[PDB]
Design a protein around this ligand. Sequence first.
Ligand SMILES: OC[C@H]1O[C@@H](O)[C@H](O)[C@@H](O)[C@@H]1O
Ligand SMILES: OC[C@H]1O[C@@H](O)[C@H](O)[C@@H](O)[C@@H]1O
Ligand SMILES: OC[C@H]1O[C@@H](O)[C@H](O)[C@@H](O)[C@@H]1O
Ligand SMILES: OC[C@H]1O[C@@H](O)[C@H](O)[C@@H](O)[C@@H]1O
Ligand SMILES: OC[C@H]1O[C@@H](O)[C@H](O)[C@@H](O)[C@@H]1O
Ligand SMILES: OC[C@H]1O[C@@H](O)[C@H](O)[C@@H](O)[C@@H]1O
Ligand SMILES: OC[C@H]1O[C@@H](O)[C@H](O)[C@@H](O)[C@@H]1O
Ligand SMILES: OC[C@H]1O[C@@H](O)[C@H](O)[C@@H](O)[C@@H]1O
Lengths: 659, 659
Amino acid sequence: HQDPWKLSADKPDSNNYYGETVANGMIGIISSPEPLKVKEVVLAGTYDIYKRGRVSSFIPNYNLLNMKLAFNGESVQTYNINNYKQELDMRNGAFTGSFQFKDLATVTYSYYALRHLPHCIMMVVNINTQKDTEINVENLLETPSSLNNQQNYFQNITNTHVNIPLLTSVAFTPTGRSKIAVSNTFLFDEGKKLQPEILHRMNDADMHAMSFDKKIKAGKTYSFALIGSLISSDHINDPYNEAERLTIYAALEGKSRLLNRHMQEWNSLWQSDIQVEGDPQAQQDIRSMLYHLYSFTRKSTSLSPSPMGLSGLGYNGHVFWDTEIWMFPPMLLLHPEIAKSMIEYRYQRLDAARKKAAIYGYDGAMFPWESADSGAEETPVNALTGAFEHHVTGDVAIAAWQYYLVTGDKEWLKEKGWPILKATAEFWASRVEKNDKGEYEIKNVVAADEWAENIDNNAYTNGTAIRNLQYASKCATVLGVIAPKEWTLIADKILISKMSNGVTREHDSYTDQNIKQADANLLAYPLKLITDKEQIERDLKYYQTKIPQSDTPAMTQAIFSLLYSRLEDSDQAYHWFKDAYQPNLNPPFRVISECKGGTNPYFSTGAGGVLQAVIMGFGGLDIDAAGGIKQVKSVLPKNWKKLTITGIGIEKKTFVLTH
Amino acid sequence: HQDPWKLSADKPDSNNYYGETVANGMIGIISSPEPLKVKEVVLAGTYDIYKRGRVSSFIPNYNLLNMKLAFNGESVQTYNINNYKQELDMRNGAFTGSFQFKDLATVTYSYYALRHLPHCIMMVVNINTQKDTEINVENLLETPSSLNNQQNYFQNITNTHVNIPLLTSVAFTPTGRSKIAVSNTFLFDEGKKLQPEILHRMNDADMHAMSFDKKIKAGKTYSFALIGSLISSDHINDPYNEAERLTIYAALEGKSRLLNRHMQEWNSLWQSDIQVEGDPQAQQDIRSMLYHLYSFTRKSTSLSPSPMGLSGLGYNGHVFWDTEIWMFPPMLLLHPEIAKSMIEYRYQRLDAARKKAAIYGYDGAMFPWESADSGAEETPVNALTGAFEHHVTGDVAIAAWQYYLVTGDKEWLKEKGWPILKATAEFWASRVEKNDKGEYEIKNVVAADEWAENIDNNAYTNGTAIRNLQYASKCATVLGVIAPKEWTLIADKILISKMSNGVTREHDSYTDQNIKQADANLLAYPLKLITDKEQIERDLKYYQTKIPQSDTPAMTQAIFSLLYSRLEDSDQAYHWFKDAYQPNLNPPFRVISECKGGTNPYFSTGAGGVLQAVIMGFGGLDIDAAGGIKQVKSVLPKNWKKLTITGIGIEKKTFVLTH
Ligand SMILES: OC[C@H]1O[C@@H](O)[C@H](O)[C@@H](O)[C@@H]1O
Ligand SMILES: OC[C@H]1O[C@@H](O)[C@H](O)[C@@H](O)[C@@H]1O
Ligand SMILES: OC[C@H]1O[C@@H](O)[C@H](O)[C@@H](O)[C@@H]1O
Ligand SMILES: OC[C@H]1O[C@@H](O)[C@H](O)[C@@H](O)[C@@H]1O
Ligand SMILES: OC[C@H]1O[C@@H](O)[C@H](O)[C@@H](O)[C@@H]1O
Ligand SMILES: OC[C@H]1O[C@@H](O)[C@H](O)[C@@H](O)[C@@H]1O
Ligand SMILES: OC[C@H]1O[C@@H](O)[C@H](O)[C@@H](O)[C@@H]1O
Ligand SMILES: OC[C@H]1O[C@@H](O)[C@H](O)[C@@H](O)[C@@H]1O
């Protein structure tokens, strides 16, 4: 089970099973332990009021791949198959099931969220017979309980060459905010005259199906494909016609051309890769982290991932600083065009951030704690983070400036970076309060350590305000503009306080409380406001035992690992690397939960932090304040013989590290 | 586990658990293996388009009793309790859970579908402490995914004596057909000044909750109650205000008065009972059958049970001949007022039956195969039974006439029985076709053996038409009316054919096919068209091996048992009695599934048939063609020392049988 490219499960156990995801940054499909079914389907960019939080959410969507297979009238079930295996191929995001049905046939099915067609899915089914058999195949479109006012359609699209039978459903999200359309077809090798007749049944209010029979002689292979398109009024004004048009398009492109384009795009993503010699488990784990970030993002868009990507409804599909600080940095180094989409998400929502600032009595752009379609605040009102956790504005500024440092794109800086940096600096200049000593305070926030609520001069928050004001001032200089001199005066006098032991104080009421996650240590990395190696170490020593084992998210130990790598402490760096994600794993595919022993995968934020521990920690790679990627001193774990990181920076550099 | 009044489960196993129901004929509550939760709640008389069949259905309703209990901030779960037990007291329909929480407290909770208040539920919680503890109690109103457009309200109803905090939700069934309201309150012993403060939280789109804290010193008992009312626009024009009014009413009646009235009505139901000496398991099983029929019916209404009563959404909550032929006869003998409600259901729907007859080209009243609110046909269109299984009309006629035979109520016969019998006879007179030999045929039906579709002269169907025409003619005579002479001419010449071996032929295309269920044998019982004991036996011999073990419902073996009891064959009668339901049981409460090895309890139809095998078979009790209840020759199982049946007929007679 240490294949560096494949995650395998023998005999999926439904009593202890956490499905894996295939995704193209638009659709995510989460696996079921049941053969030829999927557990959940999530469409990016589609939000409505639904369950948790009384705010906008991702919506469970059509399980559009669900199929029933029968052999001589006998229904295929978990209980009557043997040698049942599931496998995720991380090279091309193919999820494959395979099983034996009694003495009759071997079945393999592979499905894909097509990498080049954001709204298109395909499953390919292969049946290899050991005896004569007749198969009955049904594809079911069940309207999930999350949707309403469904309509169930079926028609034949014909010409002299084809009969494309379309199984289509149209339905609405809970408040009617979004119309969803799904359209499926079967694709056959044998052509119009010989293909099976397709029947349509509408027997339930919430389910219709298309089906066919096929006789297969012993010792033959019969293959067919299911192609589906899934799209909403959030993506296109006429989703009903666009879904049918897409499925017709995909059917006439054909399986080979679809899979070839899919493969080409996945091959391109994997030109940026991390290779570890001497630790097959670490190699597979790091590949899974890269695979999930690649699956949950999309170049050339304005999409940004939630903390759980497209693996489900975690945190309602909202966008948080989880993107800017956790998932963005490793993507910026490996695939700057992915990072570009992530900051494009914020650029597009700058006006909503300006509106939030004005509603809360500030200047400039105040990015929301949680973002969705509009860019307005989406945090549940019972969470004080929505009203008071302000560092997100500085986190957006830091990511914008880092995008420019890595790419050197001055055209992007003028059009997009500077609008963000100027407006977010104006926010901080309005947010600070000057005290009698001429110092600047940021009073009454929720800390990055969210267990500290309505406190003053949070270390991380104050650090992000310093960086936002500094980076905005540097950006103005690149563009030949005079930044307001107040930005530098404020940045230079924002309070960052020490306790009597010389340790960075987390906030003005902090002595020795347990903390939820890294806060003061984030001043060392990522902010690099703390560079003195003795201060870094004093802060690690005091805070590293302040994070409890229970109910603490994977937003701490990866930072500890990276900081110990930078201190050239191999044993401590490796201890914290393992602790960052191995206690958070769920079977059978080693997906990552939010907290130690958690059961809510896949926490893409966690993967992003660990990938920083590997690339910026073990690999020593760093965003140079002057521009570009540089390498600082680092160590490898004892047991790692070689670390190879490919496709780094705009020059696509390979870095090799050894002992 | 052979308590004659109680069904007990130690350590409910959620991997193999079928919940038990408490019901008052209006609300059913199905148990969860989880402490202080319920799995499903069903409201009678509320139908909308939903899931199965694309036709009207019962709707899963508010799980209104769901509570979260925490001890010193620690949440009570399956995993952290011990000595966890559940018990159904069949004497008063109380479902009780009990467990120990660590070293802190023993918890008991009992809930009730109040027998006298159709729309009111109550749960009583008792906490007995072994140490000082603080409890947090939350009652959750989660809008189920079956409902939409919910509103979540909370208010205090106050006067100088009370503060009644009401937690209310209002929502709609899928198409908007029905508005549902639920309103809950906590009832405290200690009075207005000392009762806990109630908080209200609205943190989710589909859930709000009310909660309180309570400090309890070691070695104390703290008790409180949750009262809820659940009602729809199918029951009252203003369900929102009626639900709050009911909960206020129940709160000011108080727990003692509510439970006293509940107990009095259950005591009255159990004045009709079946006592078996020498077989504790049979005694408990037969009590469970009586308990479910009593729970799933209601005197003084026009309610009729579905095949699954209020145990869930089985057969969409529709009414079938399952009432008239299966659940009605044992209720007519034990509690004629229950049977009166069952036939009132049909009387109220006579106009819809007349409309169905006219749409399908017949005269009189054509009762639908499946009935719900209107009395129009509700069968899914893909089931040919809706269009072609016509015997239901004769089944309604037979139950109407039996109601008069048992009660002798000539006023009821004039007002209700005769309208039914006249209209259903007019239907059959229009339904038959006279052939060249002067015989009457009933062509192109689905048989009671539903595996025989679109066949001619079904034995059971033709028998029901004969009885309907005969009973209508007898009814006319009681009322001094001349029935059309054609009814008797047709009844006397409707075809019932024999095969060469002298066995009653199931239909004109029948030779030796497997059959789904009893059909030709129903001519012996219940129709009593076949009285010759050699003919009864010839028919049992030929057909008893024609019902497969798999996918055959519990509508056969109870008839075989009864017929063998009437033939004074104790071994065969007892064989078929056990086979009728023991292979259909689900743990841990021995609920009854539809088919052998099935997993869809509770099949109330099955219980009704078995209760006939016990009362009319072992007890020999019979509806006399001339009026009243008579006793015919019968036998007991070898191992039954005594069978006592109480409350029989309008004279409330006790029958005792021994060897
Ligand atoms: O349908 C898609 C196919 O169309 C043909 O016209 C092209 O020659 C193929 O290269 C292509 O794969
Ligand atoms: O992942 C979403 C959010 O989860 C919370 O547990 C953390 O405290 C936040 O830093 C994070 O943004
Ligand atoms: O979504 C509401 C809140 O959920 C909490 O669990 C997280 O710690 C917050 O970051 C988030 O804002
Ligand atoms: O430790 C986990 C807890 O952290 C808090 O900051 C959040 O507000 C809670 O929603 C969460 O359950
Ligand atoms: O609230 C209900 C109670 O009301 C009192 O007025 C009566 O005396 C009691 O008999 C009754 O149980
Ligand atoms: O219980 C509902 C229906 O179920 C079917 O299995 C039986 O064939 C019918 O006789 C019955 O009315
Ligand atoms: O509800 C549709 C049909 O379901 C079938 O399973 C039953 O055998 C029929 O009696 C019923 O009419
Ligand atoms: O034997 C069970 C089968 O009986 C048939 O009469 C019904 O139409 C089917 O719905 C059912 O599954």
